[PDB]
Design a protein around this ligand. Structure first.
Ligand SMILES: O=C(Nc1cnccc1-c1ccccc1)c1ccnn2c(NCC3CC3)cnc12
Length: 347
């Protein structure tokens, strides 16, 4: 069964073209809608198709965001098209994206089930690429607002990571309030748990620190099915937030909390590299402004191994693209290019 549509390319002028695809199968489900895998008849390339119900009252925000993004660590919008679907008188928006075969969720789960941890070389590769994608979207004021292992796609052979799911993504403008009910259980910044509506893009940095700690630990660092439980777990590690730290995140919670004074070194297994622990404590900070920015995290000494000219993947292959930064990508701190682009790098 070959399906032919007239799809509009994701980038460039709005000039639709006939796109034919086959071998369609569901690869993802959720409250958002459905993600399919399909094969393009023309090149044989595999693609993913996110199908969502299109609102008649407004333009789709995820599509407007996707059309402006062009980064090697973000899943690319190749085409988009409208169609019918499961509901009779409803219109669906279909986003044709690059296909990526794995997720950090599945890969980390394979390691947990085998009582092994993901090798630190992969922790550095995956986390570095996640921080590059965040530096990129944050350069446009865009916050993803749902960073979690399931949204981090991976090609296991090339070790390329691609951020996906821009369904919660929004441009955060200072002074505009934003819903606090975004972000998934385990990865929510403490200001979100306290119900702040004045949060910044640093909520993505807290989420990324939770993914890093989880990859190091083999399980989530701040588990819990309620905000109280999550905050107890946060406080056990970070200690009790001071009145200033509360004011900096929370919206008027000045506080019957348990009093805890805990060393970050004792949180992880003894074989954990000290630079990984130092990176965690800098991402996972109560005060949103104290957290490292994504570009500062990229320049962290934990990723120095990635900058070594002789670094190779365990499978023998070369590392993926890591130093092809743009002016846009570096704009939050241009002097960091001196660390970020190593002498051997030609990108
Ligand atoms: O954009 C995507 N997915 C999403 C977009 N919005 C919301 C949710 C999702 C989602 C993310 C992960 C899983 C299920 C759904 C998406 C893009 C590209 N490849 N891809 C895959 N590959 C197959 C790998 C094995 C799982 C799976 N999902 C994708």
């Amino acid at each position: 069964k070959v399906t032919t549509v007239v799809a509009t390319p994701g980038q460039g002028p709005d000039r639709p073209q006939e796109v034919s695809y086959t071998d369609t199968k569901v690869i993802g489900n959720g409250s958002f809608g459905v993600v399919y895998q399909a094969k393009l008849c023309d090149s044989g390339e595999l693609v993913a198709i996110k199908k969502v119900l299109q609102d008649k009252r407004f333009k789709n925000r995820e599509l407007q965001i996707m059309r402006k993004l062009d980064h090697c660590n973000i899943v690319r919008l190749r085409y988009f098209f409208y169609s019918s679907g499961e509901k009779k008188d409803e219109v669906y928006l279909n986003l044709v994206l690059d296909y990526v075969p794995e997720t950090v969720y599945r890969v980390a789960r394979h390691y947990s089930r085998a009582k092994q941890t993901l090798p630190v070389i992969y922790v550095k590769l995956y986390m570095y690429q996640l921080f590059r994608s965040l530096a990129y979207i944050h350069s446009f004021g865009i916050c993803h607002r749902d960073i979690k292992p399931q949204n981090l796609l991976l090609d296991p052979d090339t070790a390329v990571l691609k951020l996906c799911d821009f369904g919660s993504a929004k441009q955060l403008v200072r002074g505009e309030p934003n819903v606090s009910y975004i972000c998934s259980r385990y990865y929510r910044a403490p200001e979100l748990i306290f119900g702040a509506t004045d949060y910044t893009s640093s909520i993505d940095v807290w989420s990324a620190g939770c993914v890093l700690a989880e990859l190091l630990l083999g399980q989530p660092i701040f588990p819990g099915d309620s905000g109280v439980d999550q905050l107890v777990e946060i406080i056990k590690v970070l200690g009790t937030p001071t009145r200033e730290q509360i004011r900096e995140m929370n919206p008027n919670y000045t506080f019957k909390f348990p009093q805890i004074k805990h060393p970050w070194t004792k949180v992880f297994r003894p074989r954990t590299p000290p630079e990984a622990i130092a990176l965690c404590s800098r991402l996972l900070e109560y005060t949103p402004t104290a957290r490292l920015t994504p570009l500062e995290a990229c320049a962290h000494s934990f990723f120095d191994e990635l900058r070594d000219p002789n670094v190779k993947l365990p499978n023998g292959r070369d590392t993926p693209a890591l130093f092809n930064f743009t002016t846009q990508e570096l704009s939050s701190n241009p002097p960091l290019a001196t660390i970020l682009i190593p002498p051997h790098a030609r990108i």
